[PDB]
Amino acid sequence: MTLKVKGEGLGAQVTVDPKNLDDITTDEIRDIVYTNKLVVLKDVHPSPREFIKLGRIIGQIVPYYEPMYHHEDHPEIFVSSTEEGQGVPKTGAFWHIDYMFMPEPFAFSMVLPLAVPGHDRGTYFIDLARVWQSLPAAKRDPARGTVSTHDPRRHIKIRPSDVYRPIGEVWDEINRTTPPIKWPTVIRHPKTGQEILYICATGTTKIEDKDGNPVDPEVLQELMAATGQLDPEYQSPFIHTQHYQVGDIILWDNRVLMHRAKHGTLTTYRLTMLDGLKTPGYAA
Amino acid sequence: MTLKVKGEGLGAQVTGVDPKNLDDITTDEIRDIVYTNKLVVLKDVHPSPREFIKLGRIIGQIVPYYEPMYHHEDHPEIFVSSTEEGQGVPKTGAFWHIDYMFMPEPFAFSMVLPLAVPGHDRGTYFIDLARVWQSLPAAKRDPARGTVSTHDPRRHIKIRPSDVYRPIGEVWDEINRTTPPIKWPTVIRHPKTGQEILYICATGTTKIEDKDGNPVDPEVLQELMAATGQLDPEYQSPFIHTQHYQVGDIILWDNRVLMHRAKHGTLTTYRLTMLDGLKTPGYAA
Ligand SMILES: CCCCCCC[C@H](CC(=O)O)NCC(=O)O
Ligand SMILES: CCCCCCC[C@H](CC(=O)O)NCC(=O)O
Ligand SMILES: [Fe+2]
């Protein structure tokens, strides 16, 4: 009602002012994200506090479990920056879905770039619903009704507090804190009803059937090949590029898109929200 | 060394359990399997009452249930849950609970053998309390640390046949002498795996206090309980694992980290519960 959408689909432009508790309703902005999957909230130059207000409208904000990622003044904000003492450098250099490995993966991720060097820095996205669409049934039907294991443990980053600890003690703590997790390999989006190939080049280790039996490991390899996630040059037709622009908030559906960083001083703030629907989705 | 595990995590399947060659299994082997996966199925072992006990004693020190009306006719060690006349007690565990959570030494391991199951929709729900804790933001989490929770079983003690015609006040008074309320730290650290466990029970945990006796805001217990999934009357929480009974398949699990309840012909199960000599239920966190 209050927001105007230019375009349709990945990258649609939305024309949001820091006084948003007014006409911006939660159902308005959700239906926009569900519909287009990735949108840009144009030229919002919000303050940290206003960002959070926008996040809370979108849904229930979840702070990142690991506090070295937290903004100095707000636990809610996950900070990626090249600048010493501001969050963590070089986050997300690998395909992933946010909190794909936690008990409640997010419904929405939102990124505000506060400082970008140049015009070629941003994020790659892959539509896992489209990837699924292009799959012939002969490759498709072995994935249905199977269970995928997602293992984050090797990607947990060493923290400043970890220096001089024996690596085995750090690993042991990781293993207690974020063990591998299982999700259905194919899920059905609780809102749109689309079927989603919920697998990740970096994190998905193996597929098993509904009785524990190991699926032919070339199935996982073949599905992963068809997502485009293994193309080291990033030319797959399934790969959308979204370039960062300062003050342009990138907001997207974290069930249906897989993403990774594309690549001066870079600094971005991030908020992640739940939507109260089945996460990541129903088994398909 | 002698056993092979299919899968990993809740419901993993174990194949090398031979009723006649049970002494092939070392204690450390089968313990590390249970600690690691939390819930396992020992497949197609159709043991005799006597062999079940042997399996139990390999696992650890068997503790018979304090109340004898639950006992197997011939073996005190075995807790009998059955729909059938004169066999143990009907309709046990129809509520979320940890076994002997209310006693001075809660079990490390619970083991169940189904002898007769009607259909395919009967079994046990499990909730991984380490996972529940994992999903809690610190803002909800840190007020629970270092607190003490009261667990009160008295209203759930079942009327026994010996109790008929007694005035209810005398029965209650005896319950109150026998199983009073007990206190455990609200957040526990598993003495073996080291995981932190939200050790609270919808039916049994009445109140939280700090380590000076002061009552914590009752909203804290209420909101921790909501986040466990135990209050979802339709059992659709992502934290809820379903395990269906199969005759001859022994379900064996870590009674520190899982909270469980019954998922509702003739049903008859045998149960054995063991200590492991480690701090029970765990260290305070
Ligand atoms: C299972 C796939 C890999 C998990 C990566 C975990 C570290 C990252 C943060 C970073 O890249 O430093 N997690 C961010 C999130 O999941 O939201
Ligand atoms: C804190 C809640 C305690 C209630 C359990 C008391 C009866 C049950 C047996 C039954 O359900 O009839 N005790 C089983 C056990 O603790 O092992
Ligand atoms: Fe990310």
Ligand SMILES: [Fe+2]
């Ligand atoms: Fe029980």
